[PDB]
Amino acid sequence: MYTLNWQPPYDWSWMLGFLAARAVSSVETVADSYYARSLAVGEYRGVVTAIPDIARHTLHINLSAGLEPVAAECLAKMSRLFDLQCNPQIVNGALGRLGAARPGLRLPGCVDAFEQGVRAILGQLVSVAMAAKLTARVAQLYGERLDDFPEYICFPTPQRLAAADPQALKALGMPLKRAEALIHLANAALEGTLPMTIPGDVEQAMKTLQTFPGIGRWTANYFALRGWQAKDVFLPDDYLIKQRFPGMTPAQIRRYAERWKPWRSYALLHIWYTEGWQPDEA
Amino acid sequence: MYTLNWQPPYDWSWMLGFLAARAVSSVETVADSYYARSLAVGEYRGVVTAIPDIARHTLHINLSAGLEPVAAECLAKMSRLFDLQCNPQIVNGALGRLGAARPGLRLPGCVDAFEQGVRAILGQLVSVAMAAKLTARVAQLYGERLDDFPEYICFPTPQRLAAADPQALKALGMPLKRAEALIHLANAALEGTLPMTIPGDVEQAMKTLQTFPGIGRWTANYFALRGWQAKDVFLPDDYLIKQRFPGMTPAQIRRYAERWKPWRSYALLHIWYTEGWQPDEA
Amino acid sequence: MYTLNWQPPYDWSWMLGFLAARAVSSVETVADSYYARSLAVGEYRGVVTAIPDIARHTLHINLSAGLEPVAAECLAKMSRLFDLQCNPQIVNGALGRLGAARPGLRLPGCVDAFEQGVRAILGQLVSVAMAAKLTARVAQLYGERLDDFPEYICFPTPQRLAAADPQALKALGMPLKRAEALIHLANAALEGTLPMTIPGDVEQAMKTLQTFPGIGRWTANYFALRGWQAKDVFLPDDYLIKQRFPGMTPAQIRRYAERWKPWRSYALLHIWYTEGWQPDEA
Amino acid sequence: MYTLNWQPPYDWSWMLGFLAARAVSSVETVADSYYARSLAVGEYRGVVTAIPDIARHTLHINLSAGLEPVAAECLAKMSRLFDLQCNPQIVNGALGRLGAARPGLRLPGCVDAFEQGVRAILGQLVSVAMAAKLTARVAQLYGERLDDFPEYICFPTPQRLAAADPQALKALGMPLKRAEALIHLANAALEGTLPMTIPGDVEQAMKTLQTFPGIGRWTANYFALRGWQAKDVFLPDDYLIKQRFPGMTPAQIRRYAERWKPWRSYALLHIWYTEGWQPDEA
DNA sequence: GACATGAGTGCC
DNA sequence: GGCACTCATGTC
DNA sequence: GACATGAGTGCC
DNA sequence: GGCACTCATGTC
Known part of the structure; x- marks a missing residue:
């Protein structure tokens, strides 16, 4: 019923994949074409369904009757969860090669x-x-x-x-x-x-x-x-990250990431989702 | 461009009158038929315009080009400033005669x-x-x-x-x-x-x-x-509130205000804007 | 055995009486000519007996074998208990009439x-x-x-x-x-x-x-x-003290007590023990 | 001329020598037959003199007139400085070898x-x-x-x-x-x-x-x-201590010192003053 | 007597 | 109105 | 020696 | 992973 637009490219397959792996049974439901979960804003409660219309690069949001009185807040929550503000050009331009294998990569947010x-x-x-x-x-x-x-x-x-x-x-x-x-x-x-x-x-x-x-x-x-x-935080302490940087210590890794400022959060997502990647031995 | 619902009655005359007396030059513009102001969501900036539509029980929101990436958050800000969530039948049912004169009273919020x-x-x-x-x-x-x-x-x-x-x-x-x-x-x-x-x-x-x-x-x-x-806070230390409660001390006013729980904020507004209001001599 | 000096006058009956009234069974023993009690100094334990000698203004201290290794700490504890350091000429000189009825009054301390x-x-x-x-x-x-x-x-x-x-x-x-x-x-x-x-x-x-x-x-x-x-603390919240300053509030008693600086502790004790004391008829 | 006891042996030569090197001009005077220093307790002030009596295993303390009022506290201060409470048969019965050379070692205290x-x-x-x-x-x-x-x-x-x-x-x-x-x-x-x-x-x-x-x-x-x-602290961070335990980390030193519990402080004093001392093959 | 709460009275 | 600073209340 | 920083270890 | 503690290291 409600619609929110985004700026292509947007990899919905990846976003839903990420979110589906972390879905909490009875709370969230993630399918190849839509996302839905329980939502509470104050004493208002209900279910939210988000359906991505690739063709027209827009997101269709349906709200259960109980959340209608606080419709806008629910909309803002979905926009944060789906990083709809992202201008992939600026990020894909500032990250060069790192973000070229999947330039639709978005930062999975949260609803609360x-x-x-x-x-x-x-x-x-x-x-x-x-x-x-x-x-x-x-x-x-x-x-x-x-x-x-x-x-x-x-x-x-x-x-x-x-x-x-x-x-x-x-x-x-x-x-x-x-x-x-x-x-x-x-x-x-x-x-x-x-x-x-x-x-x-x-x-x-x-x-x-x-x-x-x-x-x-x-x-x-x-x-x-x-x-x-x-948008600008790295996790030099992350398990998978420490594997992407063999032999380097938290500080060395952290020092290496300075090169991706001020979009370190995005760089982090890419490196995480590229098994072959490895640093540049200066 | 964007539209938000609200449940009648809604006293727009009063709401815009409240925001108009407190309007800050250069920041916001209040008129008989609309409200407009600068708005910053992170690095995104622009002007927001709000135009009520009595016929449809709707509020129309227009965002300047700079705020489109964070349109939803802007919509949420406006819904919090104009208390679009309010169900007057519930509030007035509880407040009784106190709100009978202006059932469209709303709680003026803020955008930040x-x-x-x-x-x-x-x-x-x-x-x-x-x-x-x-x-x-x-x-x-x-x-x-x-x-x-x-x-x-x-x-x-x-x-x-x-x-x-x-x-x-x-x-x-x-x-x-x-x-x-x-x-x-x-x-x-x-x-x-x-x-x-x-x-x-x-x-x-x-x-x-x-x-x-x-x-x-x-x-x-x-x-x-x-x-x-x-929605359930009272202001016994308010200068004007003390005049509406001749004599009485903070703890006594507070004690009397207890009868309007859990909607004391609304009760407060009704008392502030009701000239000759005075407590029951009972 | 060990002996310590004091300066006359010293009202030992008032002191011993004061301690007898608060004496704890099994820990202390108070008589008209001596005080004795258990005493622990670290891992060293035993019994201390104090016997005053009015004639030569000396206090004889005996220690059971368990306390001999820490004799001096025991002597110090005892001298603080009995306020052997007091110079009545100085204190009685400053209090004036307030302490003229019992110039030998001392501040009962503690052993720990x-x-x-x-x-x-x-x-x-x-x-x-x-x-x-x-x-x-x-x-x-x-x-x-x-x-x-x-x-x-x-x-x-x-x-x-x-x-x-x-x-x-x-x-x-x-x-x-x-x-x-x-x-x-x-x-x-x-x-x-x-x-x-x-x-x-x-x-x-x-x-x-x-x-x-x-x-x-x-x-x-x-x-x-x-x-x-x-030596310079008054007790305006004390039960008996408020009974000595009829109808006066804490800060009042306190302000009154100021004239006894810097021996308010001694004035306090004199007031407690003056049956019919009352603030100056002024 | 007050007198305090001590149990033999007591290496006064070693004790006076330790305080002598740390003697502060104008405050303390150290000689091979006596120690003397200025001393304060509240606002009572004077000079204290301590004369060891090897013959009777006794320490003679003399206080100037300005300290007499608080003689007992002064005696306690000296007994702490000179470790008069020490039972060498017990400390050495525990340290064994390490303390066999200077059985009269004492812990130099302080007066305040x-x-x-x-x-x-x-x-x-x-x-x-x-x-x-x-x-x-x-x-x-x-x-x-x-x-x-x-x-x-x-x-x-x-x-x-x-x-x-x-x-x-x-x-x-x-x-x-x-x-x-x-x-x-x-x-x-x-x-x-x-x-x-x-x-x-x-x-x-x-x-x-x-x-x-x-x-x-x-x-x-x-x-x-x-x-x-x-009595049971060790200083694994000390300059000289690092030299006594060659190539050992503070943690290793501390582990080793546990063999002297509960008298690590005395162990420390013996090791400090034993040139060429070195750890076993434990 | 300890402790949280209410009055109020006066000051930048 | 914030802020302090001194009485007066009313359970445990 | 005090004291920030940084690797690393071992036990929740 | 959190976190307390340990072993250098560079500075003042």
């Missing part, structure tokens, strides 16, 4: 910073499939079920996770430290201490995030990349 | 919490008109002039106001502590310490805000009401 | 700041006698018994009280809050966070003490007076 | 924790004779001279070094950071943050000290050793 915070923490260590399944168990235990869509469940809110029992979370298959990380993050979101929108100084912001128990450099970087969709 | 915080601060102990002109000076002195629309300036970024000279601001017409208050707020906005969207615990978030220099209970409440669009 | 801290906390709200009853109970359950002197038990150390169960202390006859205050104090004691000797800036240190849970202004002052032997 | 902290700071990275000459300058500029004994001067008090101009301190022969260290230290001493007596948890307290500006691990360890007279 808190959710992404929870996802980022649970993403620690385990594989993607495990992170997803782990997140699914948290949603099934603390999420809100939609009365008009019994198959859908809303992602847990800060009010529920903040009151959660550390041992209950532990029981879902996570260390006690990670459960406490979640409970503390929820409390921050309630208090208004978790930046829900990109701050002017992403560097200071992340430094403050690292004071949170259970959140280190990796988590804060990954949270900034996906949760604030900050 | 930082800006609103700056405005809430410059409005301390001065007339709406002075605060208006005062803010304009700060605007011209630190704003980003739109190239495509020379007469429009974007509101100062936390960036620019954080590195401002506490004196260059006092000069414009404010005590020294007033200027420090702004400079502090700006820094907070830079690292994400100022909540940009409403937190789960409004009570607690306001407490933290009150630890800010230059921000007391009044400013913090007014900020929650307009900047976060919190 | 941690102990006094526990004693001050348990002295909250209740009567002198009842507090001694409670302290005796706490010591009974958490103190160590001297092998060499079964009849005696050492006052509970900080490490023992720190690892005590709040519920176990609650049962002895105090609210849960009060018992938590004790456990917190023990922790500060272990960490070196509770000044054990009088600080250079008593006012500042007392302020720091008030941040402790369970410790308000009364407990901090009283503790500073007994635990540090601060 | 603040003073010792200052010396720990001014002894950093400079020779011993140099720290002595520098400290003497500070004592000379910030000390209260004694009226009864013109030749002697009191060590600086915390209130005085606190109101010190950094620049003034530096000019005496030290970097700025250091002078700043002394000033912070005085403040802490003033508000009661610097533990003046050994705490229940020496390790926790040493960590809290490491957060003071200018105090690292070597300074904390050393301060604890001499300022609190902690």
